[PDB]
Design an enzyme around this catalytic site. Structure first.
Site, PDB file in Angstrom:
ATOM      1  N   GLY B  10       0.787  -1.227   0.000  1.00  0.00           N
ATOM      2  CA  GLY B  10       0.000   0.000   0.000  1.00  0.00           C
ATOM      3  C   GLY B  10       0.824   1.285   0.000  1.00  0.00           C
ATOM      4  N   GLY B 144      -6.944   0.680   3.221  1.00  0.00           N
ATOM      5  CA  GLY B 144      -7.699  -0.527   2.910  1.00  0.00           C
ATOM      6  C   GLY B 144      -6.794  -1.651   2.451  1.00  0.00           C
ATOM      7  N   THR B 145      -5.776  -1.296   1.669  1.00  0.00           N
ATOM      8  CA  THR B 145      -4.751  -2.245   1.242  1.00  0.00           C
ATOM      9  C   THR B 145      -3.789  -2.536   2.408  1.00  0.00           C
ATOM     10  OG1 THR B 145      -4.814  -1.426  -1.067  1.00  0.00           O
ATOM     11  CG2 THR B 145      -2.880  -2.663  -0.428  1.00  0.00           C
ATOM     12  N   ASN B 206       2.055   7.824  13.682  1.00  0.00           N
ATOM     13  CA  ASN B 206       2.318   8.962  12.792  1.00  0.00           C
ATOM     14  C   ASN B 206       2.273  10.290  13.546  1.00  0.00           C
ATOM     15  OD1 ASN B 206       3.033   8.156  10.183  1.00  0.00           O
ATOM     16  ND2 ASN B 206       0.942   8.311   9.393  1.00  0.00           N
ATOM     17  N   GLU B 254      18.608 -11.906  18.471  1.00  0.00           N
ATOM     18  CA  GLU B 254      19.037 -12.034  19.853  1.00  0.00           C
ATOM     19  C   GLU B 254      18.268 -11.033  20.718  1.00  0.00           C
ATOM     20  OE1 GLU B 254      23.303 -13.185  20.438  1.00  0.00           O
ATOM     21  OE2 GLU B 254      23.255 -11.579  21.923  1.00  0.00           O
TER      22      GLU B 254
HETATM   23  N1  LIG Z   1       4.195   7.652   7.700  1.00  0.00           N
HETATM   24  C1  LIG Z   1       3.488   7.590   6.600  1.00  0.00           C
HETATM   25  N2  LIG Z   1       2.141   7.348   6.673  1.00  0.00           N
HETATM   26  C2  LIG Z   1       1.416   7.280   5.534  1.00  0.00           C
HETATM   27  C3  LIG Z   1       2.023   7.433   4.308  1.00  0.00           C
HETATM   28  N3  LIG Z   1       1.044   7.295   3.371  1.00  0.00           N
HETATM   29  C4  LIG Z   1      -0.137   7.060   3.964  1.00  0.00           C
HETATM   30  N4  LIG Z   1       0.075   7.055   5.303  1.00  0.00           N
HETATM   31  C5  LIG Z   1      -0.938   6.785   6.329  1.00  0.00           C
HETATM   32  O1  LIG Z   1      -1.583   5.559   6.014  1.00  0.00           O
HETATM   33  C6  LIG Z   1      -2.980   5.669   6.265  1.00  0.00           C
HETATM   34  C7  LIG Z   1      -3.717   5.579   4.934  1.00  0.00           C
HETATM   35  O2  LIG Z   1      -3.358   4.365   4.309  1.00  0.00           O
HETATM   36  P1  LIG Z   1      -2.604   4.155   2.908  1.00  0.00           P
HETATM   37  O3  LIG Z   1      -1.308   3.375   2.993  1.00  0.00           O
HETATM   38  O4  LIG Z   1      -2.443   5.445   2.163  1.00  0.00           O
HETATM   39  O5  LIG Z   1      -3.735   3.339   2.100  1.00  0.00           O
HETATM   40  P2  LIG Z   1      -3.533   2.011   1.240  1.00  0.00           P
HETATM   41  O6  LIG Z   1      -2.689   0.937   1.913  1.00  0.00           O
HETATM   42  O7  LIG Z   1      -2.824   2.430   0.011  1.00  0.00           O
HETATM   43  O8  LIG Z   1      -5.015   1.409   1.054  1.00  0.00           O
HETATM   44  P3  LIG Z   1      -6.097   1.909  -0.043  1.00  0.00           P
HETATM   45  O9  LIG Z   1      -5.672   3.221  -0.590  1.00  0.00           O
HETATM   46  O10 LIG Z   1      -7.403   2.000   0.682  1.00  0.00           O
HETATM   47  O11 LIG Z   1      -6.101   0.869  -1.178  1.00  0.00           O
HETATM   48  C8  LIG Z   1      -3.168   7.010   6.971  1.00  0.00           C
HETATM   49  O12 LIG Z   1      -2.981   6.830   8.365  1.00  0.00           O
HETATM   50  C9  LIG Z   1      -2.035   7.820   6.393  1.00  0.00           C
HETATM   51  O13 LIG Z   1      -1.627   8.896   7.187  1.00  0.00           O
HETATM   52  C10 LIG Z   1       3.406   7.668   4.222  1.00  0.00           C
HETATM   53  O14 LIG Z   1       3.998   7.820   3.137  1.00  0.00           O
HETATM   54  N5  LIG Z   1       4.124   7.750   5.385  1.00  0.00           N
HETATM   55 MG   LIG Z   2      -3.829   3.407  -1.749  1.00  0.00          MG
END
Ligand SMILES: Nc1nc2c(ncn2[C@@H]2O[C@H](COP(=O)(O)OP(=O)(O)OP(=O)(O)O)[C@@H](O)[C@H]2O)c(=O)[nH]1
Ligand SMILES: [Mg+2]
Ligand SMILES: Nc1nc2c(ncn2[C@@H]2O[C@H](COP(=O)(O)OP(=O)(O)O)[C@@H](O)[C@H]2O)c(=O)[nH]1
Ligand SMILES: [Ca+2]
Ligand SMILES: [Mg+2]
Lengths: 70, 440, 421
Positions: B10, B144-145, B206, B254
């Site tokens: 994701g 979601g992913t 975060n 370890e």
């Molecule tokens: N630290 C950090 N958090 C991130 C980043 N991108 C998204 N997030 C966090 O991840 C969450 C959103 O999920 P994503 O990873 O963007 O979504 P996804 O896994 O791509 O899932 P879908 O888009 O629904 O298919 C939120 O809490 C965002 O703040 C990133 O590059 N760095």
């Molecule tokens: Mg996504």
């Protein structure tokens, strides 16, 4: 002592295989249950829409019977 | 030399992967085209960096990594970016449609369509390993992913690789950068389903990272790029012992022995220092004692919670750079005489120490000063359960009204899975309570 | 990725044409369909709303529908009239006579299959269809009656895609009159079951804004539609430019719709020195709402805010937190973090900065209550029913539509009254 050594390692194998097996079966049940649930959701949606169509026909048939009286 | 395969899932997982792999290339002298001049054995080898990089006969060093996302636009930027030559195209895997912030779409509806191809691609990586040690899985809780596909993948990896180790880096949500109201749902569902399939999980709050960037680096409004650069330093501290050799080096496994007292109690709290800008670092050399002291400042933790109000079950210090045990020992004796470090009664109170001599590196145009020495503390503290408490409470607020639940039921899920997941979280919070109670 | 756009009936086609002009300008597409822009950000997500034809020409993925040729011919002569695909005009002759029954059951039923043929053509060539948006009014016969019929038919063929509508509510202040409450209520009945997200564009509100705020003694449909197009541009910006939040129709619905029936949004816009604190106060004020409802008379289930232009991100975050703090009683406590904020660098035409507001508020019941009142005052006298029975409908359907809409009102009240404890 050798017999016990053999039982310990066989026990470890048996539990790893049981873990794998348990995981495999639960995933299969979830994916199956999920597919059936999702398809039933879509099916009820379409069956509602096809009722709307049945009622639309029923309505135009109804106009055609009151334009004959007249 | 035991290989480790990284899997980035994701957007958050993928973007953190970008930051981590760029940083590893800098630490190891690997160029964006994969060439590593210092490496004299061509086409292979058993050096420490080979746990993370394979090699072609053309002298390219290739990350032992797969990147997976259900929509293509994040991975497309890897495909066309600075490090695009680093990866074989088949290591970067995309669908056409994302999970729309819905665990159910990630785990079932959309996820099921790509899961087999992902495992096939992971399998190809594993086949190139002579002694695969395990997997490192990077993902958000909230997406979601990140939530649903990761759970599905972890379940499938347990089936296909047995009890082969799986470690997670998990992005715990914060409202400053969240993108979905339903993130508490996705977090609880993924935590529940993954719990039995994961050996060790490092949560990254975060909000903790956001507040460190604001406060320690003076960044007015941190972006993902600011957060991710900080996160990669921490991830690098944690994996450095697998990637470099040395006399005082101690293997992550370890530390793991000490960090995991029971299978479910496997969420270490990471704290990292020093986090400081170039402008403040200049002419200010930060000693072993100063960075060690910073480890017991809750402001420097990767998860917000208060260890002063919990009990320790383990404390590990992973130093890197210009550090010798004498100074570490002095620093620890000082901390011991002055801090609220209270252990549970069934655990020894000694700090476990490792030192990697390779100093930290920074990415060009980043925010962090280049320093001579750094430290990541990994502790097992009952305090981390606060993170679960906060998330579980947000889940309860919405779930009591079944708000948004229809989006999940519509994708085939049942209310039963929500309550089952929530109860597993309740039991986990309770487990963390029990391990802190004194022995009878 | 792709969205398919449908415009039906007079109002539908008028606000529809304005929408394409406005966004075509934002995206640097001229009336011939050629790109002449300055920023690569204009083209990054152009495919959401436009097809590329050979010659590097961009063609709106748009379908124009009416039961008479009038407005459609007006469109074809409009400024961007030649941009549209000629095969995507599907007009009849019959007309609907401002009669929902005619649009939904008889006349509209006659033209519907030829509309579906175009929808299906546009859909088939989509890399991955998101879903549909429909512009129409609820007061007339075609947009209202045939528009709701089209939604039903499309859903049958695309049950797994998002259905979004921009629905213009009727008002006596602008009224084409007089059975409009019937048309609207029969419409809302359909929207409640068959769309995923509806923007309630309220003529009552557009009027009060032109008259009171803009100081226009005599507001034309033109003046109303400037408001509509500014709004429509605003609520689609997260769909059309790169970004993080509500970037597609499903992710928007998942953020905005906590209960499937409660999917009627109150949109807002600002402006109607212009600082971030001022934009923020304005987009949350009743006077800036495009629906005639006071949010201080209910509670917000969810909110999306979109800021456009060059401004401090830090300042935006602070003002947004400040709004919520100071007005906490008006956001349900049992949906944490229910306000999401997006910022896009590209401002709308003629403004340095602007803010668009999308609210799912239980106060939307004031809108439905007003329609319900006007519906019941006619229906109790069975006034003008023969226009509808004359096409085959029974009173039953009126009774049912009334009920379903009253149920919707009760449901907003239920969640408004809900407590975390
Ligand atoms: N630290 C950090 N958090 C991130 C980043 N991108 C998204 N997030 C966090 O991840 C969450 C959103 O999920 P994503 O990873 O963007 O979504 P996804 O896994 O791509 O899932 P879908 O888009 O629904 O298919 C939120 O809490 C965002 O703040 C990133 O590059 N760095
Ligand atoms: Mg996504
Ligand atoms: N805002 C707006 N409302 C309109 C416009 N044209 C018509 N209406 C409204 O639409 C309703 C009449 O429906 P209309 O679309 O004209 O009839 P149709 O052709 O059968 O769909 C009335 O409430 C009008 O006030 C327009 O251009 N803008
Ligand atoms: Ca080598
Ligand atoms: Mg009209």
């Amino acid at each position: 002592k050798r017999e016990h050594e053999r039982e310990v390692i066989q026990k470890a194998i048996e539990e790893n295989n049981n873990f794998i097996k348990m995981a495999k079966e639960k995933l299969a049940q979830k994916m199956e249950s999920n597919k059936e649930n999702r398809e039933a959701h879509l099916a009820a949606m379409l069956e509602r829409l096809q009722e709307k169509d049945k009622h639309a026909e029923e309505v135009r048939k109804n106009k055609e019977l009151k334009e004959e009286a007249s | 030399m035991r290989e480790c395969i990284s899997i980035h899932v994701g957007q958050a997982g993928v973007q953190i992967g970008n930051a981590c792999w760029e940083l590893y290339c800098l630490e190891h002298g690997i160029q964006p085209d994969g060439q590593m001049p210092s490496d004299k054995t061509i086409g292979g080898g058993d050096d420490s960096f080979n746990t993370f990089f394979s090699e072609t006969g053309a002298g390219k060093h290739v990350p032992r990594a797969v990147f997976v996302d259900l929509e293509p636009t994040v991975i497309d930027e890897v495909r066309t970016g600075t490090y695009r030559q680093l990866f074989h195209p088949e290591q970067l895997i995309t669908g056409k449609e994302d999970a729309a912030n819905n665990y159910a779409r990630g785990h079932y509806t959309i996820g099921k369509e790509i899961i087999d191809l992902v495992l096939d691609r992971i399998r190809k990586l594993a086949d190139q390993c002579t002694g695969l040690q395990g997997f490192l899985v990077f993902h958000s809780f909230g997406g979601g992913t990140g939530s649903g596909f990761t759970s599905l993948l972890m379940e499938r990896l347990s089936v296909d690789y047995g009890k082969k180790s799986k470690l997670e880096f998990s992005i715990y949500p914060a409202p400053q950068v969240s993108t979905a109201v339903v993130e508490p749902y996705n977090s609880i569902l993924t935590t529940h389903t993954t719990l039995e399939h994961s050996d060790c999980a490092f949560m990254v709050d975060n909000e903790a990272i956001y507040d460190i960037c604001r406060r320690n680096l003076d960044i007015e409004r941190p972006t993902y790029t600011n957060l991710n650069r900080l996160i990669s330093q921490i991830v690098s501290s944690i994996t450095a012992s697998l990637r470099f050799d040395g006399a005082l080096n101690v293997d992550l496994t370890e530390f793991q022995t000490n960090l995991v007292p029971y299978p479910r109690i496997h969420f270490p709290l990471a704290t990292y220092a020093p986090v400081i800008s170039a402008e403040k670092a200049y002419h200010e050399q930060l000693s072993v004692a100063e960075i060690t002291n910073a480890c017991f400042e809750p402001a420097n933790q990767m998860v917000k919670c208060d260890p002063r109000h919990g009990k320790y079950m383990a404390c590990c210090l992973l130093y890197r750079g210009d550090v010798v045990p004498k100074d570490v020992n002095a620093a620890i004796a000082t901390i011991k005489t002055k801090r609220s470090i209270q252990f549970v009664d069934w655990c020894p109170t000694g700090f476990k120490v490792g030192i990697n001599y390779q100093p930290p590196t920074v990415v060009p145009g980043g925010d962090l000063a280049k320093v001579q020495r750094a430290v990541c503390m990994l502790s097992n503290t009952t305090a981390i359960a606060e993170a679960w408490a906060r998330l579980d409470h947000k889940f309860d607020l919405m779930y009591a009204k079944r708000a948004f639940v229809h989006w999940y039921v519509g994708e085939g899920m049942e209310e039963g899975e929500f309550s089952e997941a929530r109860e597993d979280m309740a039991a986990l919070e309770k487990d963390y309570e029990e391990v802190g109670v004194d022995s009878v | 990725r792709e969205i398919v756009h449908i415009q039906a009936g007079q109002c539908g086609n008028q606000i529809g044409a304005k929408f394409w002009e406005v966004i075509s300008d934002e995206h640097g597409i001229d009336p011939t369909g050629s790109y002449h822009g300055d920023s690569d950000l204009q083209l990054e997500r152009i495919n959401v709303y436009y097809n590329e034809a050979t010659g590097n020409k961009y063609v709106p993925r748009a379908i124009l529908v009416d039961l008479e040729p009038g407005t459609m011919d007006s469109v074809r002569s409009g400024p961007f009239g030649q941009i549209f695909r000629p095969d995507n005009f599907v007009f009849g002759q019959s007309g609907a006579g401002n009669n929902w029954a005619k649009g939904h059951y008889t006349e509209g039923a006659e033209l519907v299959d030829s509309v579906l043929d175009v929808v299906r053509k546009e859909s088939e060539s989509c890399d991955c269809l998101q879903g549909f948006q429909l512009t129409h009014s609820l007061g007339g016969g075609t947009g209202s009656g045939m528009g709701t019929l089209l939604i039903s038919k499309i859903r049958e063929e695309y049950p797994d895609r998002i259905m979004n509508t921009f629905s213009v509510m009727p008002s006596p202040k602008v009224s084409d009159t007089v059975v409009e409450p019937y048309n609207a209520t029969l419409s809302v009945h359909q929207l409640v079951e068959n769309t995923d997200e509806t923007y309630c564009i309220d003529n009552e509100a557009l009027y009060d804004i032109c008259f009171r705020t803009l100081k226009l003694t005599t507001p034309t449909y033109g003046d109303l539609n400037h408001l509509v197009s500014a709004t429509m541009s605003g609520v689609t910006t997260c769909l059309r430019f790169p970004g993080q939040l509500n970037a597609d129709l499903r992710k928007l619905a998942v953020n905005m719709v906590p209960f499937p029936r409660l999917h009627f949004f109150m949109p807002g816009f600002a402006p109607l020195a212009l600082t971030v604190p001022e934009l923020t106060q304005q987009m949350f004020d009743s006077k800036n709402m495009m629906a005639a409802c006071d949010p201080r008379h209910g509670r917000y289930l969810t909110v999306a805010a979109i800021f456009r232009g060059r401004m401090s991100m830090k300042e935006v975050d602070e003002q947004m937190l400040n709004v919520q703090n100071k007005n906490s009683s008006y956001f349900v406590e049992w949906i944490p973090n229910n306000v999401k904020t997006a910022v896009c660098d590209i401002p709308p035409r003629g403004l340095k900065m602007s803010a668009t507001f999308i609210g799912n508020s239980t106060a939307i019941q004031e809108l439905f209550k007003r329609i319900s009142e006007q519906f019941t005052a006619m229906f109790r006298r069975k006034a003008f029913l023969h226009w509808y029975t004359g096409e085959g409908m029974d009173e039953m359907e009126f009774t049912e539509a009334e009920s379903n809409m009253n149920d919707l009102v009760s449901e907003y009240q239920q969640y408004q009254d809900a407590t975390a404890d």
